[PDB]
Amino acid sequence: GPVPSRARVYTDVNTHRPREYWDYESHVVEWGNQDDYQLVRKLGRGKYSEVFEAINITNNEKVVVKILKPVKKKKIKREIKILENLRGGPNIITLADIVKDPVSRTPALVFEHVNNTDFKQLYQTLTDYDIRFYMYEILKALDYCHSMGIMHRDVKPHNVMIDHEHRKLRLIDWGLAEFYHPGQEYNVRVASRYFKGPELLVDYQMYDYSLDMWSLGCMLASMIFRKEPFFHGHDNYDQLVRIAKVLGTEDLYDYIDKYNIELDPRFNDILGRHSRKRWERFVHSENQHLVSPEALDFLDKLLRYDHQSRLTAREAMEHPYFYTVVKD
Ligand SMILES: COc1cc(/C=C(\C#N)C(=O)Nc2ccccc2O)ccc1O
Numbered sequence: 001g002p003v004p005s006r007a008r009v010y011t012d013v014n015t016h017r018p019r020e021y022w023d024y025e026s027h028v029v030e031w032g033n034q035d036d037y038q039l040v041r042k043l044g045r046g047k048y049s050e051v052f053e054a055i056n057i058t059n060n061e062k063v064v065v066k067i068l069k070p071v072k073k074k075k076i077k078r079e080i081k082i083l084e085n086l087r088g089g090p091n092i093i094t095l096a097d098i099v100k101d102p103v104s105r106t107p108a109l110v111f112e113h114v115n116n117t118d119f120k121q122l123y124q125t126l127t128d129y130d131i132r133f134y135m136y137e138i139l140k141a142l143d144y145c146h147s148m149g150i151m152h153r154d155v156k157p158h159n160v161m162i163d164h165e166h167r168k169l170r171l172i173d174w175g176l177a178e179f180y181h182p183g184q185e186y187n188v189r190v191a192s193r194y195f196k197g198p199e200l201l202v203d204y205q206m207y208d209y210s211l212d213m214w215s216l217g218c219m220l221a222s223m224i225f226r227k228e229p230f231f232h233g234h235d236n237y238d239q240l241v242r243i244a245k246v247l248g249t250e251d252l253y254d255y256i257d258k259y260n261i262e263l264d265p266r267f268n269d270i271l272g273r274h275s276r277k278r279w280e281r282f283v284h285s286e287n288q289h290l291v292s293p294e295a296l297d298f299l300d301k302l303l304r305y306d307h308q309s310r311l312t313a314r315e316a317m318e319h320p321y322f323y324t325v326v327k328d
Pocket of ligand 1: 043044046049051064066093111113114115116117161172173174175
């Protein structure tokens with residue numbers, strides 16, 4: 001069978017938390033007043049929710065109302081419980097309220113308002129300092145939720161809100177987030193294709209927080225190299241081949257051999273043999289100002305097949321890449 005895996009950090013956090021903390025199916029939602037919020041305009045319609053700009057008329061403050069699409073109640077309460085567990089954490093989106101929406105007959109999550117700019121728009125103008133700064137801000141959110149026993153499992157630019165005017169960042173859409181329990185096998189059908197960790201693409205279910213670090217690596221690669229997205233697979237199988245053309249097939253086999261994982265036999269005629277590449281090959285005159293030896297070394301240490309070999313969020317925050325970022 002497959003070799004079990006454990007997170008190398010925050011392994012037992014949910015073990016020594018009270019059951020109330022992670023047993024989200026037993027959570028009791030405290031409903032606010034749905035009439036407190038006047039929807040102003042629709043912002044987006046995802047697979048699991050519609051997001052609206054609204055005003056809390058009890059304080060005349062802009063808020064964001066996320067009306068969930070009809071899904072299993074465990075998944076709704078998972079997100080709610082995770083949001084309430086992480087509330088107040090660094091750069092975690094703040095769940096201000098939960099109301100029962102009378103039209104959808106589904107919970108509407110009310111969040112703080114973040115004056116976001118489009119990441120396609122934003123990532124075109126981000127400076128080298130801007131990238132390191134926001135990466136560090138994402139790392140604060142990731143280390144916090146990991147330290148709280150939760151993996152986001154959907155880290156991608158669309159889930160990173162940035163008010164660039166006030167240099168404000170929020171990690172959002174915790175609808176795929178899960179509590180990490182040692183030895184638990186998780187759904188591999190998480191994260192967007194371009195940001196899926198190799199563990200997902202090889203169907204290894206006993207993953208952990210390190211999944212988010214791969215996704216963060218994919219984001220960093222897309223920014224400093226100005227290639228959106230970096231690993232641009234056409235499906236989940238071609239996705240792994242895209243990664244294997246950069247990280248090499250031999251370390252891929254080392255990875256699946258370490259965990260006694262077997263590749264889908266459909267990889268036999270599409271994977272091929274690929275050397276591991278040096279990150280300098282992706283540097284060119286149009287992105288070189290975003291690249292540094294620290295950037296490449298940091299990226300190198302995030303994008304590792306072996307989830308157990310990736311930098312943890314805290315380790316990533318110690319990296320020389322962030323030495324130039326002004327601390328507070
Ligand atoms: C989808 O899941 C979540 C979404 C959010 C928040 C937003 C979204 N999407 C949001 O504020 N967007 C936005 C704001 C201002 C201008 C343009 C915008 O698109 C918060 C928590 C979630 O869980």
